[PDB]
């Protein structure tokens, strides 16, 4: 993917993470599971919704064909009308189809960026109290509690609090 997270260093998505676009999977002695990041997910929904409504709103005018009749001495203006109506038909068909292809590419990149930014947001909390593996996953050098996990997700992870314990195991 362009930011390289989606179908990238994070190979697949999570059928298990049901309540959001972007999220966390954790494993610890108490269990394992999924949790959506509500803030980035809602902000993406907000953004995507606005894009869709901007597109609808800008496309909200119509060209109007008329089916006036033209006589056998009116071939020129008859044909002028046809080329005219078909001309606007071709422009708008082009505008719609290209816009859809383009915006579809950009939207997949947005989702990719959002996932990548969340990955980096966690990474910078954890610092050296955890090992960055290949795949968007971090392996803790200390025991991470359900509160501990909750705190990583909240952006309130306490790095000094686990620094000494994690140095130990990071060396040992």
């Amino acid at each position: 993917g362009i930011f390289g997270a989606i179908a990238g260093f994070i190979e697949g998505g999570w059928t298990g993470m049901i309540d959001g676009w972007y999220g966390y999977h954790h494993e610890n002695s108490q269990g394992s599971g999924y949790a959506a990041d509500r803030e980035s997910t809602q902000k993406a929904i907000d953004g995507i919704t606005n894009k869709v409504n901007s597109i609808i709103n800008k496309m909200n005018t119509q060209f109007e064909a008329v089916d006036h009749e033209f006589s056998n001495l009116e071939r020129r203006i008859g044909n002028l009308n046809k080329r005219m109506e078909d001309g606007f038909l071709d422009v708008w068909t082009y505008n719609a189809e290209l816009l859809v292809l383009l915006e579809n590419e950009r939207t997949l990149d947005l989702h990719d960026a959002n996932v990548k930014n969340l990955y980096e947001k966690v990474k910078s909390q954890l610092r050296d109290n955890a090992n960055d593996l290949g795949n968007g996953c971090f392996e803790f050098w200390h025991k991470c509690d359900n509160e501990c996990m909750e705190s990583v997700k909240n952006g309130t992870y306490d790095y000094p609090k686990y620094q000494k314990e994690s140095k130990l195991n990071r060396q040992g």
Binding site: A7, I10, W14, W21, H26, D67, W92, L101, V122, G136
Partner: protein, 325 residues
Amino acid sequence: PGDKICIGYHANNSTTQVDTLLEKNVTVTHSVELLENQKEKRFCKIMNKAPLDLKDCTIEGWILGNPKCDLLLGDQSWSYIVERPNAQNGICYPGVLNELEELKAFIGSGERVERFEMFPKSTWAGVDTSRGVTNACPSYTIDSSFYRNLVWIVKTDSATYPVIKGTYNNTGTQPILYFWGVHHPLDTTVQDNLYGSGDKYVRMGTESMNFAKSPEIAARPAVNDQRSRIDYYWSVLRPGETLNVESNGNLIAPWYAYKFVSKKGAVFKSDLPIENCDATCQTITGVLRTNKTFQNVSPLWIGECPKYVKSESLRLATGLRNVPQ
């Protein structure tokens, strides 16, 4: 062995795909189709107003008052007009309705007409108003009839066709749409028998319009057993305008005309049924009942329709690339 937290993204059972500039057929978790390709194959009311079904009459048949179009006859309000392709009753007595396309454009639209008697037969003195009928224009009940909105004026049994004269002064709010004709006989014999002898003219005028025509006698190919023709005319008398009529003979006189009230107008040439349906977007090929922004159904419509494009599908991705495990 160590505890783990991983960053990831949603996946689901979606098989719905989109195209992008970079890639085709990308399965995506959530998406929206902006294009509507479905329609109700019928005609409905628009703004809760019925369309006018011209049935077996063309537009010419209806407004000239062809005798077989009596069911249409006399007052009408419409959201749009439906003209059936095989409608057989139009100009029954052969001839040309001059400026036809421009008339069709004026009538559509057009939301209502009120039919009233513009010139009583009494208007024309010294002439016969009771005999202008033809086997070309049968009603359903009688073999020889004429348009209800015109009088084919003819010679009194005794004497010549005198100068006849008529005036109508538009006193109302509304423009009046009216018709008249000039008869062009087959023969000098038909010319002599119907109208008298000498050079005949039909002259009409208003404050802004001038008309003058004289007969052009010759035999044309037979149409409805007629080798004679009528040149038909239409015009519009504006509020406050007066119409003056004056003829020597060959006048097919305005009898009935229309108060005409005038948005987007539509004449649909279609055979679709008009049902007891209601609707917001009516297309020449059917109703669109949709929230979508594009449609591939028809460029010809009345109401609030989506935007016509040739596209088969216009699906915007909203969610993300679907990569389930």
